[PDB]
Amino acid sequence: RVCPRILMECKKDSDCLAECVCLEHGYCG
DSSP states (O other), X not given: OOOOOOOOBOSSGGGSSTTOOXXXXXXXX
C-alpha cells in the first residue's frame, strides 16, 4: 500500500513508481 499522495501523469499502471497504479484520470494514485 506504499503509494504516497502525488499527482503525476501516467500511461499505464507500471509507469507509476512504488505500489501506485494509474487511476481513471490518467494520473497515479
